[PDB]
Design a binder for this molecule. Structure first.
Ligand SMILES: [Zn+2]
Lengths: 77, 102, 104, 91, 86
RNA sequence: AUAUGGAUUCUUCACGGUAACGUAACUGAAUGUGGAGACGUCGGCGCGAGCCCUGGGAGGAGUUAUCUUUUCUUCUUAACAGCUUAUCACCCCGGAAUUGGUUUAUCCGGAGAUGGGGUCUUAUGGCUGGAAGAGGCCAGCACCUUUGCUGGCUCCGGUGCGCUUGUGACGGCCCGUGAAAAUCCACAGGAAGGAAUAGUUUUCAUGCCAGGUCGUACUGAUAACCGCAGCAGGUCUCCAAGGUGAACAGCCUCUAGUUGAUAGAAUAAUGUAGAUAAGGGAAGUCGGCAAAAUAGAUCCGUAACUUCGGGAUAAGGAUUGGCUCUAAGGGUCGGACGAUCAACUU
RNA sequence: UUCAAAUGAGAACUUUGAAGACUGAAGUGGGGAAAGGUUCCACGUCAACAGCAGUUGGACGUGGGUUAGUCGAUCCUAAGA
């Protein structure tokens, strides 16, 4: 399993003609000081690797789930 | 530095059936709790308040849920109330005096 | 206080049968056979080890790129960076001495 | 200080083997463990290994020589005689 | 070795009849000379199916047993019904 | 087998750094040379892992005549991938007596030390993905189905002449110097061909196909092997907790395992194994045979003889429990001390 | 070693529960190499066998069971043939 940090590469990867399935995981964490935030993980299945992107902001994850390609299968949880 | 935790205990199921009282419970707690040494050293450090439907303890010194379960089992065995009542937990630091499966 | 076992048919404590004890995500202790260590490549004259070149097993050099097995200079992956200055200087001086002996 | 009166290195042999044999091995064992001078180095780092073979720690050299000392009197005198026979044949 | 010598019998013990149900795996008895290529070929050609893998084992009695797994587009229950034994 | 991207080129076969060297790539025939595979035994020292020990907290179980913030238990993180991490080794500046740096162990410096600044191998650790969705521990709710549901918590640390094991740099020993080949990689050499209209790149990234034959059950020994047998006998190896203790000795205990070996009733002489004994102390017997006595550790002390290394634990004396204290022995933080933390020896 | 129940024609010896002890991590524990060859598991069963017994059994009768691109052999060479 690999990991990507830049979002353009993630979107590009969701459109590699070989990815079929993705998964959206929700993790209730805490930011080491006082507050529980809702970290989100996007996991795209390749054919020899599995790629992952981690977002802490909720709005960015909403925009991701919005602009995901409308041809890819997505397992919520 | 001294962030006070709160311990709330439900007593209802035995209380409403004649087999329990909350006032002796609260007095037993307030006079057997130890601080740094023997009992009787609660100088505005812990506070026990009875309500009949909830018993509340607030402390600032060393305290835990295990200490409270220890003192409660002591009280119950002294009053011959094991085999009928059992101390349990519902949330983190919220407890209740349920019944053994009669 | 939990005890472990070999995981292959070889029951002896030879060179190729080396165990580590590991804690799995299931709560238990388990053996794990480790592989042999790697030696750094050596100078062809100096005998010393070489910089830059990564240390692996022999076959594993067939799956690594060309930059992990060489440096950017003459005798890049075989000689020493100091056993090369010497064999430059000696060649130059020998040709010079030959030229002077032919002049006289 | 001197922890032994006379046995020295051979103190490891204890009471065994007889006195004269220990007195004989003492000379050779003191010889074969000392450090000598490298000539191509200027430094005193020579040290035996595999009798006959004397190795420089620095300088990575290797010389042949005696079995318990770098150079024995016989080969010294042989070298002297060859050095003497050099001039009479140069001219 | 024709594909009538290769596949000899089906195995019908009630421990084997559960793999065809849950695991979707046909258990066969093949000849001591067939290999994992010929077994795949013969099964595919006799029952027009999609074989995913074949495992084999030489039993203590002397013969050789095959575990042939099918793909998600077929049903070993129905195929064994067509062969007759269930 | 190859297609889609990327890089190189009209200077045909790439750039940066003074240097150690760096990188996503970045052609190389015959012949030649190199490296790994590839190696003895011991000693202490440093580091890492599992186990042991232990503090706070979140749940569950035990005891409670009296006492105990108590006793036991759960609190886990695989191969693999990316970023990063050190002893050694190396480079640049500099030019050292008033001799310096330095290991438990004495070696190093004009053949360039100490010092300042950098480069490398990644054992080994740290973080992130794999991965909490898994596994563990709890609470509630439903049952003549052979089969389920929903909630929670799964966190933060300390210590070491500890045990087991891996590994690094050193030291010692030899009239003893402690395998070979398959296989893989690189270097030197410069054949051939090609570009800029398409090549070169399959040692850069992603994408497609396949991986055959035999073993695989169970025991491994006071019942599975070899002994005429189901014989108190024989035969190679791995893992391995707490106390007492110098200790893998003896004695007790947790996790696992066993409760197997004909039984019942009485208690004579004898036999076998284990003990005590008044006064005497070898008078017994061929003969102190067999038994008895001594025994750990700390201190005072120790002869003849000697191949000077030994004899030697020579011989001969004295002490040892429990409890309350005293003095000595360290780290890390602020430039004489000031604060705090931790261990077990005398 | 002991108590009760269950099964059985029949119980000191089989099964369950309760108590009492033992091996004491150089084990009476958990795995293998060679060797053995079905001794593994289920069902039934007691003519003989397990030096008393037996409803038990590695016995007796009938069936089930061993799945690999990554663990071994296969490949290499050593002393030697
Ligand atoms: Zn020298």
């Amino acid at each position: 399993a690999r990991e990507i940090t830049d979002i353009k590469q993630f979107l590009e990867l969701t459109r590699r003609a070989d990815v079929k399935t993705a998964t959206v995981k929700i993790n209730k964490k805490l930011n080491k000081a006082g507050k529980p935030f809702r970290q989100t993980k996007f996991k795209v299945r390749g054919s020899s690797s599995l790629y992952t992107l981690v977002i802490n902001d909720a709005g960015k994850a909403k925009k991701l789930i919005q602009s995901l390609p409308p041809t890819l299968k997505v397992n919520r949880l | 530095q001294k962030i006070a935790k709160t311990f709330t205990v439900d007593v209802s199921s035995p209380t409403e059936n004649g087999v329990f009282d909350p006032a002796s419970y609260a007095k037993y707690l307030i006079d057997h709790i130890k601080v740094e040494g023997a009992v009787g050293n609660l100088g505005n450090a812990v506070t026990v308040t009875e309500d009949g439907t909830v018993v509340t303890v607030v402390s600032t010194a060393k305290f835990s849920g295990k200490y409270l379960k220890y003192l409660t089992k002591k009280y119950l065995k002294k009053n011959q109330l094991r085999d009928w009542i059992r101390f349990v937990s519902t949330k983190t630091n919220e407890y209740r005096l349920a019944f053994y499966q009669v | 206080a939990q005890r472990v076992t070999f995981r292959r048919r070889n029951p002896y404590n030879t060179r190729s049968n080396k165990i580590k004890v590991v804690k799995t995500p299931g709560g238990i202790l388990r053996a794990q056979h480790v592989k042999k260590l790697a030696t750094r490549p050596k100078c062809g004259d100096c005998g010393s080890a070489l910089q830059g070149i990564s240390t692996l097993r022999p076959r594993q050099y067939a799956t690594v790129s060309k930059t992990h097995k060489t440096v950017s200079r003459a005798y890049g992956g075989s000689r020493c960076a100091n056993c090369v200055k010497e064999r430059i200087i000696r060649a130059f001086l020998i040709e010079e001495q030959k030229i002077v002996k032919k002049v006289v | 200080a001197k922890r032994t009166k006379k046995v020295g290195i051979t103190g490891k042999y204890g009471v065994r083997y007889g006195s004269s044999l220990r007195r004989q091995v003492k000379k050779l064992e003191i010889q074969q463990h000392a450090r000598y001078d490298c000539s191509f180095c200027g430094k005193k780092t020579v040290k035996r290994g595999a009798a006959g073979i004397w190795t420089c720690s620095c300088c990575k050299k290797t010389v042949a020589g005696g079995a318990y000392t770098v150079s024995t009197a016989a080969a010294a005198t042989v070298r002297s005689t060859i050095r003497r026979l050099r001039e009479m044949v140069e001219a | 070795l024709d594909s009538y010598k290769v596949i000899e019998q089906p195995i019908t013990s009630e421990t084997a009849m559960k793999k065809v149900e849950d695991g979707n795996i046909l258990v066969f008895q093949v000849s001591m000379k067939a290999n994992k290529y010929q077994i795949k070929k013969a099964v595919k050609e006799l029952y027009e199916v999609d074989v995913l893998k074949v495992n084999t084992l030489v039993r203590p009695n002397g013969t050789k047993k095959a575990y042939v797994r099918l793909t998600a587009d077929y049903d070993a229950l129905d195929i064994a019904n067509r062969i007759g034994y269930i």
